[PDB]
Amino acid sequence: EAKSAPIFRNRVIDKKQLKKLIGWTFAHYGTAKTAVVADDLKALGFR
Amino acid sequence: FDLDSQDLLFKAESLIVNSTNRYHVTLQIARRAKQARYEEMENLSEETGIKPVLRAILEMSDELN
Amino acid sequence: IPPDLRPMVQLDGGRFATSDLNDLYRRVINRNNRLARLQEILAPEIIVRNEKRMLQEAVDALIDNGRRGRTVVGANNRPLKSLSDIIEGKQGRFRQNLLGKRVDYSGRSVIVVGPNLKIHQCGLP
RNA sequence: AAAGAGGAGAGGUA
Numbered sequence: 699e700a701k702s703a704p705i706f707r708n709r710v711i712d713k714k715q716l717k718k719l720i721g722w723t724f725a726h727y728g729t730a731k732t733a734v735v736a737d738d739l740k741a742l743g744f745r
Numbered sequence: 746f747d748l749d750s751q752d753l754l755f756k757a758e759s760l761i762v763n764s765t766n767r768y769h770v771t772l773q774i775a776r777r778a779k780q781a782r783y784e785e786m787e788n789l790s791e792e793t794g795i796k797p798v799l800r801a802i803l804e805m806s807d808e809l810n
Numbered sequence: 811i812p813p814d815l816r817p818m819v820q821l822d823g824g825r826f827a828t829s830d831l832n833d834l835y836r837r838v839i840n841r842n843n844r845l846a847r848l849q850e851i852l853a854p855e856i857i858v859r860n861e862k863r864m865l866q867e868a869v870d871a872l873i874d875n876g877r878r879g880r881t882v883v884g885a886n887n888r889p890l891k892s893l894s895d896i897i898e899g900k901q902g903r904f905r906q907n908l909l910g911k912r913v914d915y916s917g918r919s920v921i922v923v924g925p926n927l928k929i930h931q932c933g934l935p
Numbered sequence: 936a937a938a939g940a941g942g943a944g945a946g947g948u949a
């Protein structure tokens with residue numbers, strides 16, 4: 699649920715990178731943080 | 746209210762994680778909720794503004810401390 | 811069979827509804843009564859065998875229609891529904907009333923898109 | 936107190 703810091707992805711972000719990020723978040727933090735992360739990404743993309 | 750659904754989601758996730766079977770913990774929560782509802786219905790009035798299942802989740806998560 | 815599983819129904823203003831089990835039961839009863847009456851008065855034994863054959867065919871049609879010979883046809887050229895047609899196929903008892911059901915406390919409506927919602931939330935009219 | 940019973944055709948929407 700903690701103790702892992704995200705890496706700075708200095709590149710272009712397509713669908714594959716988003717799927718990789720979602721998998722990493724689920725594997726490292728749990729099933730409750732992933733929903734909020736997906737919601738934030740959806741809001742940013744819509745904006 | 747000060748209690749949002751996000752806290753309940755985290756508490757439920759914590760309850761699921763710290764156990765060996767999800768079906769067993771679901772049955773335990775259901776039993777506790779039924780007992781709490783029966784206790785409420787026959788005595789006093791209590792803080793009725795919370796459903797029995799949410800109450801059972803709250804007490805069971807607090808017992809983990 | 812009990813009479814409440816084959817209802818008569820009182821629509822049509824002056825007439826009555828059609829049920830298929832009742833017709834087959836009536837035919838069986840009619841043939842049985844005719845055969846008994848013929849046997850009582852010592853009829854010649856070339857007419858009795860005819861009645862026996864028709865009784866056998868009537869019972870066969872009641873049990874399973876069209877399995878052996880010709881099929882019994884109602885008013886229009888449409889075969890009747892026997893006892894074996896109630897439990898047989900996709901519209902039979904097993905696959906229609908036992909493995910699936912209609913339920914209470916249910917609704918249905920069109921869906922639109924709601925942004926600004928949370929992933930565990932929905933909007934109900 | 937009461938209130939719809941089934942069946943058969945034809946045409947549509949995910």
Ligand SMILES: Nc1ccn([C@@H]2O[C@H](COP(=O)(O)OP(=O)(O)OP(=O)(O)O)[C@@H](O)[C@H]2O)c(=O)n1
Nearest residue numbers: 900910918919920921922923924946947948949
């Ligand atoms: N015989 C059919 C026809 C349609 N469907 C359902 O309806 C959908 C059809 O969706 P539709 O909107 O007609 O087409 P799409 O493939 O979604 O394409 P688009 O919306 O871009 O036109 C199918 O995927 C399926 O879920 C079905 O189950 N059986």
